[PDB]
Structure 1
Amino acid sequence: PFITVGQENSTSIDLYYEDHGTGVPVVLIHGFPLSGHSWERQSAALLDAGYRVITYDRRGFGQSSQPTTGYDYDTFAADLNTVLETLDLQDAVLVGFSMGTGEVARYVSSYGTARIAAVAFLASLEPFLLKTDDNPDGAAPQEFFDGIVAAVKADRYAFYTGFFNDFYNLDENLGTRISEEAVRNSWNTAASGGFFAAAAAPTTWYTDFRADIPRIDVPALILHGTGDRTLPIENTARVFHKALPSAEYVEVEGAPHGLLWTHAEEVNTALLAFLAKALEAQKQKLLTEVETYVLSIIPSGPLKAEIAQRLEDVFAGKNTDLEVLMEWLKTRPILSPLTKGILGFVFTLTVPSERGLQRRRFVQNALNGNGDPNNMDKAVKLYRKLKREITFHGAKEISLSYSAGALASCMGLIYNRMGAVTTEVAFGLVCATCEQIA
């Protein structure tokens, strides 16, 4: 999986990325000098929680292309933008690490937060690393950073082992927090990067982000270890906390720089606690929107009120048995068969506790579609567009074109254990079919 972001000479600067899981998109940006695979402990906990994980490799690092141009944060942000535009992500979360936090703060400032719901800064560079007469809160003068760039160009392979010692604090963490095999992969990941990228990237560490911080309007999370070597805490996060008081501030006690692996228990705990508090407001907004499209089919009366509460208890998570429900749903005087099917459909997508034994006939004949071959031949063409679809905003848009007949049969395909798509796009088909009946 590759996304093109640039064009160097006769080649195209392509970036490696991975799009896993279904739900709220969480974009992860790695640090120097690793790949997107470095988030393998965080990506694990984000998948079990239900989030959609998207990790991409920075140019010159990992499996991405290795050009000798475009090594400033204006290019690094222009790449992140192209990725978000190509993926068409909406209300996503940007989580950065090391250099990754430098793109999270630059993109937000330069392109806005129309696609952003929340951000996070793990072991950040912000606001400034370079120590000048202007900024005393710097970590080191430019002579120091020029000492690193030269030390890479001499022998970048021998430079890595020294760097990955101040990355994990191996004299304290090896054999306890991190194994030597785990370290080896990090070296293998770094050594398999672009030689030019390894020598040009350190010149971006001392970037002035003081102008980009105020442009953060979305909820933010700031995290940093108290034993960081590459990025001293009192020169970064401690003074990042004063620049943006709106963000929650978390110091992991005794954590090194590469705290993504060493303190995975601590990081994942805080990262999930932040997301489930800053995304809860929008994650249920669909549940009341899906409820809206569903209720716009039910004829007004005593039924419409109880049905709406059979959606409230279910969407929330209250215990509801289907047998009393589905029986009751069938024997209805004013409900047309087609609505019985949609309700029977939605009531199965939202609960994993249907006992997994029986199916219903009143819905199965409702989501039939008469049995017309042409009507079925279009329904599978929709499912084809839905099996390669991800978002609710996209599944509804596509399934609003096809006729009301093909929509019924397409819902049947998913319901009759034939086709299979995520519950987020399943609502899309439902809410699109509901707009047809309006």
Structure 2
Amino acid sequence: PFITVGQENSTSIDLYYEDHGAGQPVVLIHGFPLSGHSWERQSAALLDAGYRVITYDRRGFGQSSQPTTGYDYDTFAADLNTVLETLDLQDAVLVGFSMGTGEVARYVSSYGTARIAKVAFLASLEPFLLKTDDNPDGAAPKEFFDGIVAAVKADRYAFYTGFFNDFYNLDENLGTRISEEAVRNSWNTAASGGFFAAAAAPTTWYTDFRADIPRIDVPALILHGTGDRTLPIENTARVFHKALPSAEYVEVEGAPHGLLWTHAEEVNTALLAFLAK
């Protein structure tokens, strides 16, 4: 199913989405370079607890259109605004994973929370990944992220292998918490995403969300793995909880960046306990 969010030359930019269940609407917004199907273990848990689950694929990923324009959080948040207005959701919960935590913060900042009852940030980007003079809490200088973009442009298909090795801490989790088959499925999803988005999306990772955070005026959850090699907990979740002290806060012991799958039970128990309130 698709929702049109804009036009690109002679084509419409359509985002693939699904809408399941009945109950309070929970919108799940996936990370790079996957799709709304990456939430399958959380979608199953939410459906089992009587929620309505809505998922969509960010432009350039999954089954959505693959434009060569719009890779920036104002456009990503305008796409989410179109989704939410089209579905006319009320009392909705927005749950972001990694890149999706940017859509949540920028959307609440720019459009407000009239349709929103709660937000959850899992494996967050916030507050601002660049290590700069004005942001000493950042994870790394911009040249580090520039090198990731260059590696995608050199051969995205080979880049995905090393990417998922650190995304899922495969040296620790392959064969225990994640099978070789589930990693292969992630690689297939990544390769199905657009070539342009694959290399342009990482330039948005280090967006500065510090001015968006004070506008988060609904109940919030921040959750992160202590073994996240991709987005270090010290420069993301721990600093984000200082910036958003009203949020509930959970650290999942030993979990990697790809904790929706490897630590599904720990994510699902924490997310449903938060949504029950």
Distance 1:34 1:148 in 2: 17
Find the counterpart in structure 1 of residue 215 from structure 2.
215
Cα deviation, residue 65, structure 1: 0.1
Distance 2:152 2:261 in 1: 24
Note the residue ranges of structure 1 that are not aligned, 5 or more in a row.
278-438
Find the counterpart in structure 1 of residue 235 from structure 2.
235
Deviations 1:203-256 (A, max 9, x none): 001100000000011000000000001100000000001011100010000000
Distance 2:36 2:249 in 1: 25
Distance 1:276 1:145 in 2: 38
Cα deviation, residue 201, structure 1: 0.3
Deviations 1:84-118 (A, max 9, x none): 00000001000000100000000000000000000
Deviations 1:319-365 (A, max 9, x none): xxxxxxxxxxxxxxxxxxxxxxxxxxxxxxxxxxxxxxxxxxxxxxx
Q: Secondary structure at the match of 1:256?
A: coil
Deviations 1:106-161 (A, max 9, x none): 00000000000000000000001001111011111111111111111110000000
- After TM superposition, the structure 1 stretch with the greater mean CA deviation from structure 2, 143-152 or 251-260, is 143-152
Distance 1:263 1:271 in 2: 12
Bigger radius of gyration: 1
Q: Secondary structure at the match of 1:203?
A: helix
TM-score, structure 1 as length reference: 0.63
Cα deviation, residue 182, structure 1: 0.3
Find the counterpart in structure 1 of residue 102 from structure 2.
102
Distance 2:212 2:193 in 1: 29
Distance 2:213 2:226 in 1: 22
Q: Secondary structure at the match of 1:61?
A: coil
Distance 1:250 1:257 in 2: 14
Q: Secondary structure at the match of 2:176?
A: coil
Q: Secondary structure at the match of 1:251?
A: strand
* 4+ long deviations beyond 6 Å: none
Q: Secondary structure at the match of 2:124?
A: coil
Q: Secondary structure at the match of 2:6?
A: coil
TM-score, structure 2 as length reference: 1.00
Name the structure where helix makes up a greater proportion of residues: 1
Within 5 Å, give how 1:12-411 maps onto structure 2.
12-277=12-277
Cα deviation, residue 5, structure 1: 0.1
Q: Secondary structure at the match of 2:8?
A: coil
Q: Secondary structure at the match of 2:240?
A: helix
Name the structure where strand makes up a greater proportion of residues: 2
Q: Secondary structure at the match of 2:7?
A: coil
Distance 1:162 1:137 in 2: 26
Distance 1:141 1:2 in 2: 38
Q: Secondary structure at the match of 1:12?
A: strand
Q: Secondary structure at the match of 1:117?
A: strand
Which structure's relative contact order is higher, taking Cα pairs within 8 Å and 6+ residues apart? 2
Q: Secondary structure at the match of 1:255?
A: coil
Q: Secondary structure at the match of 2:186?
A: helix
Q: Secondary structure at the match of 1:80?
A: helix
Distance 2:133 2:247 in 1: 28
Q: Secondary structure at the match of 1:211?
A: coil
Q: Secondary structure at the match of 2:94?
A: strand
Cα deviation, residue 259, structure 1: 0.2
Q: Secondary structure at the match of 2:15?
A: strand
Q: Secondary structure at the match of 1:269?
A: helix
Cα deviation, residue 35, structure 1: 0.6
Distance 2:10 2:212 in 1: 34
Give the count of matched residue pairs: 277
Cα deviation, residue 31, structure 1: 0.1
Note the residue ranges of structure 2 that are not aligned, 5 or more in a row.
none
Q: Secondary structure at the match of 2:140?
A: coil
Distance 2:91 2:241 in 1: 24
C-alpha RMSD of matched pairs (Å): 0.4
Q: Secondary structure at the match of 1:164?
A: helix
Distance 1:10 1:216 in 2: 37
Distance 2:259 2:193 in 1: 22
